[PDB]
């Protein structure tokens, strides 16, 4: 199937409590494989998946230098952004950055990404053409013209079309035991009486990978969209994910209702009922 690689970065200033905290993590699909935390004792980038441990020491040296350099540029950018927004040096502010690439089943680039947010709001984003920018406001237009003058997008494009895709393909081969295995969900329906006239039907999906999944309740074959409670897909802690969908049904109506499960790890979309 299609695959993705993403690097996420957060810097959070804390005036009066030292320099900004910097945390960055790398993902392939929904699998964490590297992390770096500026508040660790001897901060280095560390493996978080078995198939990245085989990379040699100079891979880890270069990766650590890049994280440290990024930590420094975020600190300068946070001070810069205080000026751009006429803000006091007394508050805590947040800088977020994400970049990465998507590849299709044949391993060619589907699209690349590079975007930033300030205080949780979009700031500047590389467009899908990998050559122009979208700035969210007039402060971000300042950055956009600095970045156009330095030709940042040309270097990002070379990276996103070159090493991003090439190293993602390498990671996918080395971790193919896990990265190229879909784990289907274990599914069942539970029943929880509410009152004499109502009960909850809860449709479960457990232990699945990757996180993408669809759970729908139908009543007489029609989607119960507006009346279904759908919790966010959540991590089990062991690489897999969980989700449930629930619906409140009049007692004695239970068999009008069907739960529908689609997951890439399932040959056919499943259909489940409750049975006492």
């Amino acid at each position: 199937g299609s695959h993705s690689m993403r690097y996420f970065h957060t810097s959070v200033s804390r005036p009066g409590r030292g320099e900004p905290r910097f945390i960055t993590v790398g993902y392939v699909d929904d699998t964490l494989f590297v992390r770096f935390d500026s508040d660790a004792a001897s901060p280095r980038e560390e493996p978080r998946a078995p198939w990245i441990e085989q990379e040699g020491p100079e891979y880890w040296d270069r990766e650590t230098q890049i994280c440290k350099a990024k930590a420094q540029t975020d600190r300068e950018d946070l001070r810069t952004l205080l000026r751009y927004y006429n803000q006091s040096e007394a508050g805590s502010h947040t800088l977020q950055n994400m970049y990465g690439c998507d590849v299709g089943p044949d391993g060619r680039l589907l699209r690349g990404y590079h975007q930033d947010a300030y205080d949780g709001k979009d700031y500047i984003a590389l467009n899908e053409d990998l050559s122009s920018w979208t700035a969210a406001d007039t402060a971000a237009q300042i950055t956009q013209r600095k970045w156009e003058a330095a030709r940042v997008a040309e270097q990002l494009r070379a990276y996103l079309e070159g090493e991003c895709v090439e190293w993602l393909r390498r990671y996918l081969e080395n971790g193919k035991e896990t990265l190229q295995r879909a784990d289907p969900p274990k599914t069942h329906v539970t029943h929880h009486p509410i009152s004499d006239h109502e009960a909850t039907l809860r449709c479960w999906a457990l232990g699945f990978y990757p996180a993408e999944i669809t759970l729908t309740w139908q009543r007489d074959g029609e989607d119960q969209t507006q009346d279904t409670e759908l919790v966010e897909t959540r991590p089990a802690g062991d690489r897999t994910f969980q989700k449930w969908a629930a619906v409140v049904v009049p007692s004695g109506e239970e068999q009008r209702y069907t739960c529908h499960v689609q997951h890439e790890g399932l040959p056919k979309p499943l259909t489940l009922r409750w049975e006492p």
């Binding site: 690097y7 790398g26 990766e63 890049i66 994280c67 350099a69 990024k70 540029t73 300068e76 950018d77 810069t80 952004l81 751009y84 970049y99 930033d116 950055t143 600095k146 970045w147 330095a150 940042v152 270097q155 990002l156 990276y159 090493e163 991003c164 090439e166 190293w167």
Partner: peptide, 10 residues
């Protein structure tokens, strides 16, 4: 494999 400008400032 991470990217770095081979500096980019906001």
């Amino acid at each position: 494999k991470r990217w770095i400008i081979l500096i980019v400032r906001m």
